């Protein structure tokens, strides 16, 4: 009548800080575009949605 408690559990491996996957859920994809416009002699760069 020699009782033993046996226990175990899990955690993150010590080097998971670099080797790890992340689970994400995305929504409607917003597109943003960079444009160069040249009119006559004048050109311009700009980013727009």
């Amino acid at each position: 009548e020699n009782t033993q408690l046996s226990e175990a559990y899990v955690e993150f491996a010590p080097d998971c800080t670099i080797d790890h996957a992340v689970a994400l859920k995305v929504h409607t994809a917003a597109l943003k575009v960079g444009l160069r416009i040249v009119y006559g002699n004048t050109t311009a760069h700009l980013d727009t949605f």
Binding site: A13, P14, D15, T17, I18, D19
Partner: protein
């Protein structure tokens, strides 16, 4: 410096060694391997840092802490492994591919080894196999265990050691159980020999009502040390976290060189391509169409071969090994 139950000692059988492995990590892109054994490294007898020697557990009923030098430890998986670094509880070395890892101390003719299974596989980085990092090639992102001793990949928790019984402490004489503590060490003992009984004896003491030697336990109160949470020790009553020590050799990012495969030869025809490929090693070719439907395919080739690919007006893209993507548009 605890000693625990290795599954494979020197000869054939599981048994107790100071240099049991318990767990292994092999994720470094170089194949550098980090090992944890119950032994220590880089510390002298009192624990002060001294690189040339290490301390470990004794094979005696006094069970003190003994010592030896770095020149007589060896690591081997299939052939001998080159040690890269050591920090207290931890080792790190380069190993050839194999199925299990062995740590061995050769104290002259006193050989003590532990072996544990781990399918270490020669790994590589990039889109092509290679035996060695070539002299010339692209520099890409990789992750290698930092050889520096003073890095930290994490921490491990240590606790006060639990009871550690012995039999030289006990003795049977004329049907009576006596205890024989070593010199000057207050040794705590307990048993029921009938009713329960406990105390501490520093000298040879007799027991009443005790008919068999197996009935009792004695051990010295060594609370001046901290031991890892190993699964092969009976812990103390109070298992509170009492120490943390760093996990050296953090898996740091860096740059690695990778070969550039032979540039294929393109042979062209009506709406499509025939790529002629040469690759001494398994190298990955990955193509995809540039339209609504990707039709992407990926495959590893060896030797020399040729692949036909239909190219639409929308175009086709291919990546050969580590070479940059190449785009095409049919006429």
């Amino acid at each position: 410096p605890y000693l625990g139950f290795c599954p494979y000692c020197r000869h054939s059988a599981p048994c107790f060694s100071p240099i049991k492995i318990e767990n292994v990590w092999d994720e470094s892109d170089d194949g550098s391997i980090r090992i944890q054994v119950s032994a220590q490294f880089g510390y002298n007898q009192a624990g002060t840092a001294d690189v040339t020697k290490f301390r470990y557990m004794s094979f005696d009923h006094d069970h003190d802490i003994k010592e030896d030098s770095m020149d007589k430890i060896a690591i081997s998986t299939s052939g001998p492994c080159r040690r890269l670094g050591h920090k207290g509880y931890f080792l790190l070395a380069q190993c050839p591919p194999g199925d299990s890892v062995t740590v061995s101390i050769t104290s002259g003719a006193s050989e003590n080894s532990c072996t544990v299974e781990k399918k270490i596989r020669r790994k590589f980085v990039g889109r092509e196999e290679y035996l060695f990092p070539p002299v010339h090639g692209k520099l890409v992102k990789c992750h290698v265990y930092d050889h520096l001793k003073e890095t930290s990949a994490g921490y491990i928790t240590m606790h006060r050691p639990g009871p550690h019984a012995y039999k030289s402490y006990l003795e049977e004489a004329s049907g009576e159980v006596y205890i024989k503590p070593p010199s000057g060490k207050n040794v705590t003992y307990e048993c029921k020999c009938g009713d329960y009984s406990t105390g501490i004896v520093s000298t040879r003491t007799k027991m009443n009502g005790c008919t068999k030697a197996k009935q009792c336990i004695a051990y010295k109160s060594d609370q001046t040390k901290w031991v890892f949470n190993s699964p092969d020790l009976i812990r103390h009553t109070d298992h509170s976290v009492q120490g943390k020590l760093h996990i050296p050799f953090r898996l740091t990012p860096t740059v690695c060189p990778v070969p550039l495969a032979h540039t294929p030869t393109v042979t062209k025809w009506f709406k499509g391509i025939t790529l002629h490929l040469t690759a001494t090693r398994p190298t990955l070719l990955t193509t995809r169409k540039l339209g609504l439907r990707a039709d992407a395919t990926a495959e590893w080739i060896t030797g020399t071969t040729s692949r036909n690919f239909s190219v639409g007006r929308e175009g086709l893209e291919y990546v050969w090994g580590n070479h940059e993507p190449v785009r095409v548009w049919a006429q």
